[PDB]
């Protein structure tokens, strides 16, 4: 009750004010733990009340920070898990087959235990996601290869550190200005023994002619295979497409969102202009419009491969993955 | 560490907002459809303050009613807000003397006015202050917060400009003065007698009006009954360096924002900065106050649109525009760099530039308003042109076929309003 | 002479020889105006020629007429540079104009002779609308005893493609008429595209009937060579950045129905002019050589 | 003689053929005071070259020509020798010293070629004072024609391509672009400008200030966000440091990035460049010929720590600070020169008509 | 010829080597060939004869009047000056790499450059953030217990670092037009006390720039004999390298 309410309020305020969990996996774990706490603590008779309350909590969580899709992704995953559990315990996708062939009020005592067990299994699968993704590094990196990365991605870092145990290759890291987080990635990879280069975004095209493949992370994967990545990733994808350089996205399955690129102006995250133009400029700040978008939209035609904890896939298959994770009625939430 | 407290002064004892502040207190003035005290409370809550005492004297009834209806008075708010009211308050020194008398603060509280807009985290400043208190045996008493700025910025009003002389290696304040109408700044040589090195004269500091104080600050305020303002305390403490040193230090931030809305120029500058997202995450679309009437959506060129706006055909919102819920805009209009409150009605073929419209304002067709300000439920008739730097207060109605002068302030109250008016400008 | 008889001369000379192009008729009219001027100053001659070109371009809104007018103005300026005295300059300009008229008359046969070699036996040729130079090219090809098929588009605003099909059937060449929306459907059947031009812009692109750009884009998408036949007097120092950048005096009066569009040089394989077979990059050079 | 400047730090293997220097290190510590081997004007010019006191292409060319005018004024021919050969041979060590301070730009290379051709053309029978006066006058005339009149002509040409209500995107700092926009605004065109900047030089801020002082509405952003703002952009106006014989545009790094992203958004790309910056050399990529700036400039203070501080302690870590990039001619729609509006493929043609 | 060396003496060889030798030695190792010396004549105008036995590359000496000031002595040798002047004093005993000062005069096209050292009537020196440009200079005699700064200076430079105890090395790089101004206005008597503060004042009213390099290795032993031992105490340390 009070503990649950204060935990929810703290989570919402942390999302609204930023900071909190740097790791996306940590954010997913905290979201799942909070959802489990709501399921255990909150009182509900039938599954319909659970749907309504989880939907309200997820709506509040995503309204706190719409650019943080992992929270909504986990909320929809929990809703799908609850729906599947109810269908298994009570009963026995839209398609041409279903179209040709063709009630949550009922109550069950053991449904809650099954829901918690499924959520715990999901958490266990989430725990080993990074190792599962990194275990595929040797199948995609050959000897004396050149890899291009932008910003700081922990999944890509684990990928490269696992590949470096048996192969020698070069990694080029482009800083993601203004938050030049690529410097930390470069120094980490150098500490791991990999030979690394640090450069600004302005050189992304210039050196792309000498890059064998591009390995990047993302914040979100849309239903059509599009990316909500850090800013400057669209230019990197365009430069890779110019040279037909394969672009690999190493992203866990919990970053898949059933949304579509129809949404406008809430996609990119806009922050204080101080990052781009300092406050000490003076009077010219009065008449100059300064905008600092954090995220970028990447169309699916610029992506070659998705590597996740379940293996490799093409963007054209992303829809099927989206069909296996979320019910079509939970996209609106 | 003990819980972090904060003393909030909801009374501006100066009267730089007359005659606007006659009806509504300055602490409740809407900057971007949100009152200044809301921004101050949000800033205090975000920085880790757990206890916040508010002191209000002038029109304390409305302030208390607004506070009890706000988010921070909910039982779920981590920052507890207490309201202390007394009609005998005349200055900040009186408030601090009352604080000392009632022993409200135990150690290391935050002193700030009720009209500050900031996103500053004082955790590093608090750590430095506490470390120097522990090392130097509580000799230090106060650390001021300053923002690295430029003298040419709009937020650097001439009245509030301050030049400081500090010790570089330890961030100790040695001299402090204002630059109101002075082309020459003088510094006593005694500071150089204190140290042969480290003395630096800084003019690139914008006074955020945030301080980290100690109970000894309240004790000194009680000892010296002549201390009315914070400047009085700073000057009296710095001039008497020979006896009872009680050093004052400073902290400078370069990536965060901090400002105080002390006049109309400051109001315009801070409103522009907030609309342009300089106080992120405190943005109009963030809706940091959980109220349904202030929700909106953000769009390219900094366009903020609330629920049920229904913008007319042919009208253009160029950039930096905020629209409240229920506001109706006519056709073939031109709004730019303006904030419009909820429930406003705007005619057709009207050009608003750098104006600020509060809730209830109705504007007739064909008007031209530039760099003006309209208060609650103000009215404007047809064929009216407002020159820059014009103010209409509290349901003032301006008649048709008149061009107002530049610095024309109009209010229902006769004396303070430069042109008393009811339904026109010609008598 | 006078505006009324200037327009009358233009229209009558176009009428009496339906074969001669509009630009050739405009240049002939301007040369006749030069012949009977009764002036004594090269400044007044330049002003009067500019006014006559303005009137002629007001009579019809074709790019070729304006191109010919600019070429005539450059010719007058060059002749003035050569000879300072106006009395000596006038006769030289008259004879040079006569030679220029003969050359621009022979231009069509030169283009046909140079272009007929690029079409093979059994090739499928796609054209866009009526073009006299394309007709001459096909006549030269059939005179060379070559067998080929031709597709034309109806060119909806004025069914000049039907006129081209009739003129080709008059010589008994197998031709087909397809809709303006069938070009993308018919591109895979064809082997190369031959179109005319109403004017060649500075960067090597062309201005031509409203259907040319889509045909060029489809040919590029299906990797088909795109050939343009155009005379040299249709070279204009215009640089359209896009379709909207085309001057409006050439779109309309010649819901919204522009008469011409612009094709970028990257969509053009070769240009066949009286100067020879050129890459699109050559045209700019030509213009840069003409204006010092 | 003049000692060889030491390369600073470890370079990327792909760029190991290029020199990489340190801004703090200067050649003047090992050189004599007063300057004897190198002319004092050349020493001062190299000092402000290596410290970055003058940076622009036209600014660098003008400063070089002013220092060369000082050298010609201070020059005296030796007995039994001719100015035409002695001056040419004497200028080479100064040019080598200047290149050691910082690699020469294309505009400076063309200026050196012009000055060497003009000095060679000086007859032996010509009097020394007359020859020096004619050399100084030729330098002044070169500056006039190739900079001022060229910029005015390019402004007049670009006025026809700027309409009311269009959005123009510019990158970094270019005096020609700023002049074009300022005169376009003055003549009566109404528009807005989008300014794109990149680390670590942040030269675009310069242009921003200019626009603010001219009354032109302006927007500011960094290069990674460029793809966000190109949907609302109508034309892209880019300055050039050099135009190559194959039509490629050698410019500040990130220019080809902007050209590619603008082509992805169906935005025409216009390049303005004076014909004296046209080069006969060809270049297909940014690796074979480029400049390596000081790597320590990449260090930035984020939060309270500098991640790239003491980056040389890591053996496998390298810092790359590219200066220039090359834009292929297929990404450029139009070049504006004092001769007019031309395609990129016409760049060699100009090189043919300017030479003879 | 960007610099002409001028040594000021209006000295007694109090040390291991003659006091004049060390500034001359520094000027020789930095690259100077021709050096102009002004010899005292109040006691005896025979310092030229004494220095005629030296082994320096090239020396040019001029006897002075009975009593003259440093600005007056610069006025004495005006026909001998054709370019920017490097003014030194015979008491300078230091091992500065001269490029640390001359470069300040080179890169920024400075009107005047000077060298000062950290200390072991005090002089108040105010510099900018970079620590190179000199913005303010004062001595306690002129000011009545109040250090005064113009508002425009703080508008252009909003951060001024103040040094209270620093030692001036009296080593100056000066432009020609400074000496020309000294000609047009003969009121100034000493460069170190009036001329340089006047130029600092004129920096904020064609533009005037003044730069100073602050050093923390060694400095000149003061004219008073109290520090005259210290130079010797350091001389053996510097004799090995020099």
Author numbering:
A (entry chain D): 8 to 99, 106 to 115, 121 to 351
B (entry chain I): 40 to 466
C (entry chain A): 1 to 254, 268 to 305
D (entry chain G): 166 to 521
E (entry chain E): 1 to 10, 27 to 136, 154 to 238, 259 to 295
Paper lines:
After the recognition, eIF2 is released from the ribosomes as the guanosine disphosphate (GDP)-bound form and regenerated by its specific guanine nucleotide exchange factor, eIF2B, a heterodecameric complex of two copies each of the α-, β-, γ-, δ-, and ε-subunits. Sandfly fever Sicilian virus (SFSV) evades this cap-dependent translation suppression through the interaction between its nonstructural protein NSs and host eIF2B. Here, our cryo-electron microscopy (cryo-EM) analysis reveals that SFSV NSs binds to the α-subunit of eIF2B in a competitive manner with eIF2(αP).
Here we determined the cryo-electron microscopy (cryo-EM) structure of the eIF2B•SFSV NSs complex, which revealed that SFSV NSs sterically blocks eIF2(αP) binding to eIF2B. We successfully purified the SFSV NSs protein and determined the complex structure of human eIF2B and SFSV NSs by cryo-EM at 2.3 Å resolution. Two SFSV NSs molecules bind one eIF2B molecule and are located between the α- and δ-subunits of eIF2B. We were able to assign the amino (N)-terminal ~200 residues out of the 261 residues of SFSV NSs in the cryo-EM map. The N-terminal region of SFSV NSs contains a β-sheet, followed by a helical core. The interaction of SFSV NSs with eIF2B is mediated by the N-terminal β-sheet region. The β-sheets and protruding loops form a concave interface that embraces helix α3 in the N-terminal domain of the eIF2Bα subunit. One feature of the interface between eIF2B and SFSV NSs is the abundance of aromatic residues on the SFSV NSs side.
